[PDB]
Design a protein around this ligand. Structure first.
Ligand SMILES: *CC[C@H]1/C(=C/c2[nH]c(/C=C3N=C(/C=C4\NC(=O)C(CC)=C4C)C(C)=C\3CCC(=O)O)c(CCC(=O)O)c2C)NC(=O)[C@@H]1C
Ligand SMILES: C=CC1=C(C)[C@@H](Cc2[nH]c(/C=C3N=C(/C=C4\NC(=O)[C@H](C)[C@H]4CC)C(C)=C\3CCC(=O)O)c(CCC(=O)O)c2C)NC1=O
Ligand SMILES: C=CC1=C(C)[C@@H](Cc2[nH]c(/C=C3N=C(/C=C4\NC(=O)[C@H](C)[C@H]4CC)C(C)=C\3CCC(=O)O)c(CCC(=O)O)c2C)NC1=O
Ligand SMILES: C=CC1=C(C)[C@@H](Cc2[nH]c(/C=C3N=C(/C=C4\NC(=O)[C@H](C)[C@H]4CC)C(C)=C\3CCC(=O)O)c(CCC(=O)O)c2C)NC1=O
Ligand SMILES: C=CC1=C(C)[C@@H](Cc2[nH]c(/C=C3N=C(/C=C4\NC(=O)[C@H](C)[C@H]4CC)C(C)=C\3CCC(=O)O)c(CCC(=O)O)c2C)NC1=O
Ligand SMILES: C=CC1=C(C)[C@@H](Cc2[nH]c(/C=C3N=C(/C=C4\NC(=O)[C@H](C)[C@H]4CC)C(C)=C\3CCC(=O)O)c(CCC(=O)O)c2C)NC1=O
Ligand SMILES: C=CC1=C(C)[C@@H](Cc2[nH]c(/C=C3N=C(/C=C4\NC(=O)[C@H](C)[C@H]4CC)C(C)=C\3CCC(=O)O)c(CCC(=O)O)c2C)NC1=O
Ligand SMILES: C=CC1=C(C)[C@@H](Cc2[nH]c(/C=C3N=C(/C=C4\NC(=O)[C@H](C)[C@H]4CC)C(C)=C\3CCC(=O)O)c(CCC(=O)O)c2C)NC1=O
Ligand SMILES: C=CC1=C(C)[C@@H](Cc2[nH]c(/C=C3N=C(/C=C4\NC(=O)[C@H](C)[C@H]4CC)C(C)=C\3CCC(=O)O)c(CCC(=O)O)c2C)NC1=O
Ligand SMILES: C=CC1=C(C)[C@@H](Cc2[nH]c(/C=C3N=C(/C=C4\NC(=O)[C@H](C)[C@H]4CC)C(C)=C\3CCC(=O)O)c(CCC(=O)O)c2C)NC1=O
Ligand SMILES: C=CC1=C(C)[C@@H](Cc2[nH]c(/C=C3N=C(/C=C4\NC(=O)[C@H](C)[C@H]4CC)C(C)=C\3CCC(=O)O)c(CCC(=O)O)c2C)NC1=O
Ligand SMILES: CCC1=C(C)/C(=C/C2=NC(=C\c3[nH]c(/C=C4\NC(=O)[C@H](C)[C@H]4CC)c(C)c3CCC(=O)O)/C(CCC(=O)O)=C2C)NC1=O
Ligand SMILES: CCC1=C(C)/C(=C/C2=NC(=C\c3[nH]c(/C=C4\NC(=O)[C@H](C)[C@H]4CC)c(C)c3CCC(=O)O)/C(CCC(=O)O)=C2C)NC1=O
Lengths: 160, 177, 164, 172, 39, 48, 162, 162, 177, 164
């Protein structure tokens, strides 16, 4: 959350929030309504987003679903789509929070360790997230898609 | 036109290469003897009138056919012309010595000089002698080896600049040859 | 081109006179400022790729609209063209840092820039955003010396003023 | 014994997984060189005796102790063995150059050569100096046009020199 | 995925310098009539 | 629009930092770091 | 490993000679045959899961007793079906390895060397795998020399199974 | 006889197997290499007696003692010059046979097998034939892959002589 | 590098012999006549800078095409580099005279210089002309037959010393060829 | 090799300058020191088999147990192997006078020698006993000049301290 981060950054210095931080909190609470609208649109179109992202991933990375691949079989493919749904949900959280704190605190800290322990290639997850980003930005307006892909790009950068 | 600092950027621009620390010390050496080049240009332009009047009269007194009627330096107007025709040459070699490379006299003074003297009927080998006397006077001056007048300098070497002004003076020889 | 020496020789030539004492006096100013600008030139040169990458990153963050279809950045190769376009500007002020004047900037990047970017629909605001982001990220402990950053920023904001 | 194509497959069976498309355009690009690589091995096998004899002659004009009476290069048989030990390493470097991988070089040439030379008393550092002198002549002979189309071959002569240095550090 | 390493926005220089230049005061002086074993 | 205007710069900076870190680790992976045996003994080094 | 490269090296080493023009022509044949085989490897990689599931279904449709008879050798239970799909994936992986490598080098090393020992002890009919390979040959959906190159490695496995 | 054809057959017969795609690619390399080698064979056929006479003259100019020293091994008399020209023609004929055949099969069978026995007994130095082959390589007047293919069979003979 | 003392060690190590007799006979003469070699290398190091300057000006006043645009001596960096190269060659041949042995002349400058000048496109015959001019200046300074320049020496003949630098300059001129 | 002239020339190349008139004095002082140094060396060269002969048996007189069966002087061949090895060190010392430094000793006679002598089980006290006998056999009358003996004994002392 933007409010939380402003409060901590002001707390470390032992000072009240300066007028710049209050200005930014004000601008955030004023834009909260379109934030909720965008989260609506992304939230309730989750099935198509996950499905079409899974397709673009499996066509771009046939090895992961090839015989023996990490997501090989019905159950493993279902689990991979489950992971993509996890990350779409986190992106909606980040959109409503106004900052990548929800995405980063849940799903980004220690993601490389987890996926290395599971035997999953992290580049495949990055490809899936990019495919979901294109599919989801296709359903938004220009400025809305720009603001929404803003978080997919951060999730991709953290997942290199 | 082009100076010595601007000579390396048009060479590096041909390869889209950044000028880096591999060729910068040849420039820093050129900056380090800045005062040597600077006093040398001053020693050239200090005694520049006798430099011209001596050279043209020395070119005359070895080939006294120009003073005869029909000579190119015969009349009073043509002698006034020839006394400035080499003063411009010295004036541009003084530019090229200060700038650090022979680009400022190449397209400004030397471009088109050959057919000018051909169309006017100026004897080229006489002008060769006239500028060789000026070259000899230049290496006499900037090495402080003129037996005729001495100037005070800080001690050291100046032959690196003396070969430079020599290489400027046959470019004026080659261009109307 | 437009350096310190090539004004004092062209003025003396247009006047038609020898290199006088004031002409000898202005080349001495190179001896005191070259030690500041040449060390700016090669810390620019030995760190240029990173600088260019940061500059490229800045304009797309400010102007994400031009990655839309029908815009200046459609595919990846136009973004590569953009990074090449700004690396050229970073090379040119490296050239102006070593010359001593703004000679290599004018006829190589600035003269003619107004027509190409108008005719090829390239916004100059995204150029000056990436240049200005490189300008304000300069500081005395990490990047260079106290006097290197001065005219390194002065050659940058000259380009900022000329593009706008 | 593997070639460079074999290596990615032997690492693909191990994970039990299909070659992804990035390995495939890594392999098509490599193939797309193709003619350059065989031009390189053609230039080395055309001049093999010259390389070996000039390197040995430079070695003994440099180190005269090997042909000194009592030296390791003494006797008609020891010189004959030294002459074509170098030709063995040249042959296996050319095999590894045409394979794209130093798998034939390690397996039959450099496997156990060090204690072989130790058990005989052969000085391995002089063998390494002979390998380096063959390397210099081979990279000098590799980058001439000699009636080939003009282009760059730099990534191939770097690999060719790397095979020679791999042979030189393993002997000694 | 999208690994930006180095100057990705252009191809790289042709990599050619096939000449040897005399090292002045920096040729590695080795011993005569012997081989530097190890070090 | 007023809210995006403030957060654009910091968002871009954080993305640039992330990919900087990634390129750095790729090159020190290629250059021998993380392959000393003190790294290969730990199990997280083995995962890397 | 049987490649066109390694057999040329093995023929040069048997005489103990340098690489003649014979070996260079044998390598050049691999190079201007490789462009279609790498396309065949890409295409068989892309269609992999679909082809494995279809081949297992075709074996079950041709031999319905394998899904009905009790016993460890049959795919009557779930682990039997999992191991059957694993075996079909093994066959497809060897075919792709032979495609990218350029000869029957991988599958000679990994599949047919000591194959009938397993089918005799674990009581597995090779006709099942023949029926799977015929489906894979009929249903890969390739064209031209891509098809000619993939089919030529499929029926080598069929010929060794028969 | 070492052709790309017969070595592919010898590799198929050693396993006792049918001709795989490995052998077919090795043969295809011969086929789209043959077009320049047949031109090289035509061109070396056309320039033959000029090249033989020039090569003999180049050997006599490089080693003038061969025309002066008495003895049977030297070309001091007329039959010695005739046999020297006969030997140079033999070398050129083997080079053309290896060109049209596609490998070092003919000259391995006809020239180098037991060659130094003759040079040791008959006391004929191999450096003479090296000097002749260097002239033939320098003076055939070919271009492109025709030159690359003729020169590659010339220096094989040079490498065996050295 | 080896001097004359080291070279009878490494040629009698290679024979396994003891140094003595005829090869110590020539080491005796070095410790005899080293005063002549010292006046020799002094007559080079006191005249070196004028030697390279006069050499490159003699090359330029023979062939002006290097000072023409497109020439190798054109511009600020190239002709300074050429002065530097000629002086380096002068420095190494002066050492090779002082050592009485030409090993370091091979190992530190002549090793791989011709291929370097081919890779840079440097014309060879002009540099051969330059080092022949330096050879003439060196033997003129060694016979004390400089028409312009005088030093006082202890009286005697230095023909062998004069001959030694001609062999060394011919080694340079053949190694660049 | 570090040598007479070669040490100065190589130090006057690392500073990249022409030989200094300081640097013709170190050459002159090194040439005058080598008059004596060559004097001793030709006495060693013209007469080496006698001094090696009288120095070898000085080892066996001190260590008579080497002639025992099982030891390193057991055969006749192991005896003149020792006599060859003493002559090798005298030839290397004869170099270092004509060389003018410990170069050939360090390179061709000391480097790796201790490990070889340990592997073959040769006592290094035996190799130093013959040299220590050779050192005090010297006399500044009638053998050579007094200025020669100090350089000769100095290189012998270097070899004794290197071996032991
Ligand atoms: C430049 C020559 C260097 C050198 C060579 C040398 N080698 C030997 C002896 C042998 N070398 C081998 C080596 C190989 N055998 C193999 O099968 C292969 C293929 C991988 C190699 C590299 C063997 C088996 C011997 C012993 C048999 C023999 O040669 O008679 C010798 C001396 C012969 C002997 O020891 O009696 C020499 C001189 N040594 C040098 O000094 C050069 C540096
Ligand atoms: C920017 C560069 C620049 C120059 C170099 C000069 C070059 C120059 N010289 C002359 C013109 C001349 N130049 C000479 C000079 C000479 N004839 C000789 O016999 C001697 C060899 C030599 C003097 C040393 C003479 C004599 C004339 C006049 C010719 C005549 O009318 O008789 C003219 C024609 C214009 C005029 O006549 O007024 C020009 C353009 N002017 C320039 O603007
Ligand atoms: C035939 C008629 C005739 C003349 C008119 C004079 C002209 C003249 N002067 C010099 C040669 C020179 N001329 C000067 C000129 C000058 N020195 C000064 O201090 C003054 C400032 C300035 C003129 C007053 C200089 C410096 C030299 C160089 C030689 C020296 O230093 O004496 C030369 C030789 C040029 C050369 O060497 O190539 C000639 C021919 N001599 C003659 O034989
Ligand atoms: C307004 C006009 C004006 C100038 C142009 C300069 C000229 C000038 N020259 C030198 C200083 C010098 N100048 C020379 C040059 C020479 N010495 C010789 O014996 C040769 C004849 C000649 C070479 C052509 C040398 C050798 C030094 C000392 C070293 C150096 O600074 O370069 C210095 C001091 C720099 C220093 O030494 O630290 C200055 C300020 N000064 C002025 O006031
Ligand atoms: C010597 C100096 C020098 C320069 C400064 C550049 C200037 C320059 N850029 C472009 C060309 C271009 N420049 C850009 C750059 C951008 N467009 C954007 O979306 C961003 C605003 C910006 C990058 C941050 C792009 C995308 C093109 C290609 C446009 C096109 O081809 O339609 C062109 C046309 C030729 C070409 O396509 O390359 C030129 C001359 N080139 C030079 O030679
Ligand atoms: C030649 C130009 C040139 C630059 C502008 C920088 C550009 C630059 N700065 C930073 C990186 C940084 N830059 C700063 C900024 C500063 N650091 C301080 O100590 C000051 C307070 C302040 C001077 C403006 C900080 C704090 C970081 C580290 C955190 C970050 O990445 O922002 C990075 C990431 C990695 C790195 O440090 O290199 C890069 C590429 N580098 C260059 O080579
Ligand atoms: C028997 C085996 C055999 C071969 C090797 C090739 C030989 C060969 N090489 C090339 C083709 C080539 N050969 C080279 C090689 C070089 N160019 C140079 O300047 C370097 C000296 C050298 C690098 C080592 C290059 C660079 C090309 C292609 C030109 C290019 O890629 O631009 C071609 C032209 C056809 C093509 O481009 O594909 C042929 C026939 N053919 C054969 O049948
Ligand atoms: C047209 C262009 C041109 C030149 C620049 C000069 C250059 C030059 N100088 C000399 C020749 C020489 N150059 C010198 C050098 C010097 N003399 C001294 O007293 C100084 C200390 C030192 C620097 C000036 C010496 C000593 C000789 C030999 C004696 C002599 O001929 O003067 C030679 C003849 C060398 C030969 O080939 O034998 C040449 C061509 N001559 C020319 O024709
Ligand atoms: C240890 C010994 C040693 C040397 C002798 C020099 C040799 C040498 N010279 C040059 C480099 C050069 N050398 C010359 C010299 C000449 N060109 C000519 O036309 C003339 C014949 C000649 C001067 C008289 C020039 C002009 C260059 C620069 C070429 C360029 O601009 O790329 C270079 C390349 C590096 C550089 O550009 O600086 C080297 C290695 N360097 C050494 O380390
Ligand atoms: C460290 C600096 C240093 C030197 C520069 C020389 C200087 C020098 N030279 C000689 C002495 C001499 N030098 C020469 C040499 C020559 N005589 C000639 O007329 C020829 C031009 C030239 C030949 C190259 C000769 C012939 C002698 C006398 C014989 C001799 O001692 O060699 C002597 C001994 C006698 C005397 O004091 O004069 C000395 C100290 N020695 C040094 O220690
Ligand atoms: C550099 C030349 C050099 C040598 C010649 C030898 C040393 C040496 N000394 C002697 C032999 C001798 N050496 C000495 C010398 C001395 N004994 C004393 O009582 C004095 C303390 C001391 C110096 C006066 C004496 C007295 C003899 C006996 C005379 C003789 O045997 O001929 C002999 C020959 C006789 C023999 O072998 O027994 C030799 C070869 N070592 C060397 O390094
Ligand atoms: C290197 C490549 C490779 C091959 C070819 C291979 C075959 C293979 N298949 C096996 C078993 C099996 N294979 C099958 C497959 C089938 N049975 C049916 O009824 C179906 C029709 C058919 C599936 C299409 C089954 C059910 C088993 C278990 C049999 C048992 O455990 O007794 C076994 C016994 C070991 C085990 O239990 O896994 C081997 C070795 N293994 C390999 O590693
Ligand atoms: C299958 C291919 C083939 C080869 C390569 C071949 C070589 C060959 N050359 C021979 C002789 C010879 N070869 C030469 C040739 C030369 N001597 C010189 O001095 C000249 C420099 C040089 C000519 C270029 C001469 C003069 C003889 C006769 C030597 C003798 O009879 O003692 C002989 C001895 C038998 C005879 O008298 O003819 C053989 C077998 N014969 C073959 O059938």
């Amino acid at each position: 959350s933007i409010v939380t981060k402003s409060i901590v950054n002001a707390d470390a210095e032992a000072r009240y929030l300066s007028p710049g931080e209050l200005d930014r909190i004000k601008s955030f609470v004023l834009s909260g309504q379109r934030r909720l609208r965008i989260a609506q649109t992304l939230t309730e179109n989750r099935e198509r987003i996950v499905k079409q992202g899974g397709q673009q991933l499996f066509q771009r990375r046939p090895d992961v679903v090839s015989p023996g691949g990490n997501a090989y079989g019905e159950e493993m493919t279902a689990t991979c789509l489950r992971d993509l749904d996890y990350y779409l949900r986190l992106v909606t959280y980040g959109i409503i929070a106004g900052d990548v704190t929800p995405i980063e605190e849940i799903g980004l800290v220690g993601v490389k360790e987890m996926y290395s322990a599971l035997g999953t290639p992290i580049s495949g997850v990055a490809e899936g997230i990019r495919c979901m980003k294109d599919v989801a930005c296709s359903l938004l307006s220009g400025e809305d898609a720009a603001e929404v892909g803003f978080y997919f790009d951060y999730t991709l950068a953290a997942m290199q | 036109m082009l100076d010595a600092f601007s000579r390396v950027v048009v060479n590096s621009d041909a390869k889209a290469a950044y000028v880096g620390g591999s060729d910068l010390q040849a420039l820093k050496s050129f900056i380090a003897d800045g005062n040597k080049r600077l006093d040398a240009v001053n020693s050239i332009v200090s005694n520049a009138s006798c430099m011209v009047s001596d050279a043209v009269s020395g070119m005359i007194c070895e080939n006294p056919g120009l003073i005869s009627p029909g000579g190119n330096c015969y009349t009073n107007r043509r002698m006034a012309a020839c006394l400035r025709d080499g003063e411009i040459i010295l004036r541009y070699v003084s530019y090229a010595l200060l700038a650090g490379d022979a680009s400022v006299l190449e397209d400004r003074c030397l471009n088109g000089l050959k057919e000018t003297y051909i169309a006017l009927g100026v004897p080229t080998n006489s002008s060769i002698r006239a500028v060789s006397i000026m070259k000899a006077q230049a290496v006499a001056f900037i090495t402080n080896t003129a037996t005729e007048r001495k100037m005070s300098f800080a001690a050291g070497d100046c032959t690196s600049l003396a070969s430079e002004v020599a290489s400027y003076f046959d470019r004026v020889g080659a261009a109307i040859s | 081109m437009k350096s310190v020496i090539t004004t004092v020789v062209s003025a003396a030539d247009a006047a038609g006179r020898f290199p006088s004492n004031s002409d000898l006096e202005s080349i001495q100013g190179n001896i005191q400022r070259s030690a500041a600008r040449l060390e700016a030139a090669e810390k620019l040169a030995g760190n240029h790729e990173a600088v260019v990458k940061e500059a490229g990153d800045a304009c797309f963050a400010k102007y994400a609209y031009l990655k839309n279809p029908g815009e200046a950045g459609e595919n990846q190769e136009k973004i590569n063209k953009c990074y090449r376009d700004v690396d050229h500007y970073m090379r040119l002020v490296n050239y102006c840092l070593v010359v001593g004047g703004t000679g290599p900037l004018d006829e190589w990047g600035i003269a003619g820039a107004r027509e190409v970017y108008r005719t090829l629909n390239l916004p100059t605001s995204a150029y000056v955003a990436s240049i200005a982001y490189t300008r304000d990220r300069l500081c005395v402990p990490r990047d260079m010396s106290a006097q290197a950053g001065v005219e390194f920023s002065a050659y940058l904001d000259y380009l900022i003023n000329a593009l706008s | 014994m593997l070639d460079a194509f074999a290596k990615v497959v032997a690492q693909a069976d191990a994970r039990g997984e299909f070659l992804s498309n990035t390995q495939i355009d890594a392999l098509s690009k490599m193939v797309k060189e193709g003619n350059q690589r065989l031009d390189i091995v053609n230039k080395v096998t055309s001049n093999a005796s010259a390389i070996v004899t000039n390197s040995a002659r430079a070695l003994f004009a440099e180190q005269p102790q090997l042909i000194q009476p009592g030296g390791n290069a003494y006797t008609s048989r020891r010189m004959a063995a030294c002459l074509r030990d170098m030709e063995i390493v040249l042959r296996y470097v050319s095999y590894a150059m045409i394979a794209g991988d130093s798998s034939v070089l390690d397996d039959r040439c450099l496997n156990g050569l060090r204690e072989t030379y130790q058990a005989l008393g052969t000085p391995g550092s002089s063998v390494a100096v002979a390998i380096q002198k063959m390397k210099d002549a081979s990279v000098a002979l590799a980058n001439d046009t000699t009636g080939t189309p003009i282009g760059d071959c730099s990534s191939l002569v770097a690999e060719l020199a790397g095979y020679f240095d791999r042979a030189a550090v393993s002997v000694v | 995925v999208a690994a930006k390493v180095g100057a990705f926005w252009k191809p790289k220089a042709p990599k050619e310098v096939p000449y040897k230049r005399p090292m002045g005061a920096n040729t590695p002086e080795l011993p005569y009539n012997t081989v530097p074993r190890l070090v | 629009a007023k809210f995006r205007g403030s957060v654009l710069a910091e968002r871009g900076a954080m993305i640039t930092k992330a990919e900087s870190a990634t390129a750095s680790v790729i090159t020190s992976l290629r250059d021998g770091l993380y392959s000393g045996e003190a790294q290969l003994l730990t199990a997280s080094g083995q995962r890397l | 490993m049987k490649t066109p490269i390694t057999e040329a090296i093995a023929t040069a080493d048997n005489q103990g000679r340098f690489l003649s023009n014979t070996e260079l022509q044998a390598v050049n044949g691999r190079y201007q045959r490789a462009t279609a085989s790498l396309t065949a490897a890409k295409a068989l990689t892309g269609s992999a899961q679909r082809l494995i599931t279809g081949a297992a279904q075709a074996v079950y449709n041709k031999f319905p007793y394998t899904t009905q008879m009790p016993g460890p050798a049959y795919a009557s239970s779930a682990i039997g079906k999992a191991k059957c799909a694993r075996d079909i994936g093994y066959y497809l992986r060897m075919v792709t390895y032979c495609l990218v490598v350029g000869g029957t080098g991988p599958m000679d090393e990994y599949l047919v060397a000591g194959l009938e020992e397993i089918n005799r002890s674990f009581d597995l009919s090779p006709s099942w795998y023949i029926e799977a390979l015929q489906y894979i040959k009929n249903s890969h959906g390739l064209s031209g020399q891509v098809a000619n190159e993939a089919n030529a490695y499929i029926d080598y496995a069929i010929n060794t199974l028969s």
